[PDB]
Design a protein around this nucleic acid. Structure first.
Ligand SMILES: [Mg+2]
Ligand SMILES: [Mg+2]
Ligand SMILES: [Mg+2]
Ligand SMILES: [Mg+2]
Ligand SMILES: [Mg+2]
Ligand SMILES: [Mg+2]
Ligand SMILES: [Mg+2]
Ligand SMILES: [Mg+2]
Ligand SMILES: [Zn+2]
Lengths: 56, 51, 196, 67
RNA sequence: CAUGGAGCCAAUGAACCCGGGAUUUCCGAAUGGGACCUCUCCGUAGUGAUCAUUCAUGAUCGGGAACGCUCCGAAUUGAAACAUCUCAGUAGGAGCGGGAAAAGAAAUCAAUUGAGAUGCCGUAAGUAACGGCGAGUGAAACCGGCACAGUUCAAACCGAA
């Protein structure tokens, strides 16, 4: 259908479930990883230095 | 009908219990300084992301 | 000359290509190729070198043959736009030697021990072999020891992955003193890595 | 004072302590059952006093190796 | 938090504060198996993976505001364009790790003849040096301070002491 409100009626599925380790709704049900804390990918918790300004 | 497991139903029950008017005696004791909480919603509005 | 047999072993390994050691190389290389990346061997292949580097016959001391490829740092062509000086990567060998790679793999395989030293033991057209000496710090024999109890300290964890071994200090540019070491001591990071 | 002090709990015998524990549990069950029907309790301090007393008794048993 | 009703607790010393114990659901390094199922399956009540020994037992795993060590590593920008150069070993990434870490007792620096481990601060100095010798980049030693500390193996001799 149209790219606007006509194709937004098929919006009945879900792509992210709820994570066990952090409780945030960011668990990818296809790749089986949490996109916020990294659960499923690793035993460590996801942190990147680009999640904040260079502190200078 | 959205067949749920135990945990999903548990979280749904909690989110149901949070829709409550603040008790009248709380409003009396705090001298009309507490009249609402940020957990109030309505079922036909923004969907909750509990599940 | 009244000489120990360690001296004779040292002489024999002084020039491998011109002694009986070449035939032993021919036999040993096949058995070594059949084996895996990291292998525990009961006795060191070269006794004199091990004793020189701090090897003793006691519990809690382990020796291992590691296996590492030859060549430089295998590097990928950049996907996006560089500036024609950073675009080339085929002739850019690494900045880390092969002994360091060997010791780091050995450390990764043995999570409870700690690396002490290593030495060269052979090589062919595809591979190089080193032996790494590992010491267990939580064994009572090591704890009672007076020449090895320094390893039961809270500054010796991860001793190989922070460049504290001998090859690590060679690679950090701190094998000497004086001219040329202006920007390599007391560390590479202290001078914004302009040394090395 | 309280439903029981620590001195009486430590002084009693093992069966005496257990019996006091069952009596307290039964009274708590009755008190909760009455209050569950939307009624003002006849004495709404009983529940707190009872639960704290049962906590005392269980602590004393666990300390004396009883359970 | 948060002086409303009705109750209870407290001189058997409460409330409160300092120190020490107990209970401590499920997930989580998560570790008997399994997770678009924070629960579920067999219950054989459960040492998950990798390691060391005398094979009794023991070690590692995750977190921590910044600081620390090792390795990999851009472009916008400046040069009034731009390619060496600069931005810059910066931003970013991987590994390891403590209350600090790294270094550390000369195969050193000097100059005619001397000094005597290391680190940090001051100065040397925008100097020597590099560079479409353009724009720019850029030290160390001598000297003055803070604080001071030196030692252990391999081998020659004895051969289980
Ligand atoms: Mg579109
Ligand atoms: Mg930063
Ligand atoms: Mg491997
Ligand atoms: Mg140190
Ligand atoms: Mg320009
Ligand atoms: Mg750690
Ligand atoms: Mg050193
Ligand atoms: Mg530069
Ligand atoms: Zn998560």
């Amino acid at each position: 259908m149209s790219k606007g409100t006509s194709s937004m009626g098929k919006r009945q599925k879900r792509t992210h479930a709820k994570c066990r380790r952090c409780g945030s709704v960011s668990f990818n049900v296809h790749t089986k990883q949490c996109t916020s804390c990294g659960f499923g990918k690793t035993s460590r918790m996801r942190t990147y230095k680009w999640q904040a300004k260079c502190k200078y | 009908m959205s067949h749920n497991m135990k945990g999903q139903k548990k979280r749904l029950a909690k989110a149901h219990k949070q829709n409550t008017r603040v008790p009248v005696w709380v409003i009396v004791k705090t001298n009309r300084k507490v009249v609402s909480h940020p957990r109030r919603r309505h079922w036909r509005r923004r969907s909750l992301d509990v599940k | 000359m009244v000489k120990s047999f360690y001296g004779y072993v040292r002489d024999a390994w002084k020039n491998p290509d011109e002694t009986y050691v070449n035939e032993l190389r021919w036999e040993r290389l096949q058995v070594w190729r059949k084996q895996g990346s990291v292998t525990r061997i009961e006795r060191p292949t070269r006794i004199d070198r091990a004793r020189s580097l701090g090897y003793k016959a006691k519990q809690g001391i382990v020796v291992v043959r590691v296996n590492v490829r030859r060549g430089g740092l295998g590097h990928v062509r950049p996907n996006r736009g560089r500036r024609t000086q950073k675009m080339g990567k085929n002739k850019v060998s690494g900045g880390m030697s092969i002994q360091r790679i060997a010791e780091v793999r050995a450390d990764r395989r043995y999570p409870n021990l700690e690396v002490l030293n290593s030495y060269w033991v052979g090589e062919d057209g595809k591979h190089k072999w080193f032996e790494v000496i590992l010491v267990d710090p939580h064994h009572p024999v090591i704890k009672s020891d007076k020449n090895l109890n320094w390893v039961c300290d809270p500054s010796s964890r991860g001793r190989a992955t922070r460049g504290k071994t001998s090859a690590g200090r060679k690679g950090r540019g701190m094998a000497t003193r004086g001219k040329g070491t202006e920007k390599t001591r007391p560390s590479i990071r202290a001078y914004k890595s302009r040394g090395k | 004072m309280a439903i029981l002090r620590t001195s009486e709990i430590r002084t009693m015998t093992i069966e005496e302590r257990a019996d006091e524990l069952e009596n307290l549990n039964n009274e708590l069950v009755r008190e909760r059952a009455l209050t569950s029907a939307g009624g003002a309790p006849e004495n709404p301090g009983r529940i707190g006093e009872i639960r704290r007393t049962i906590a005392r008794i269980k602590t004393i048993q666990h300390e004396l190796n009883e359970i």
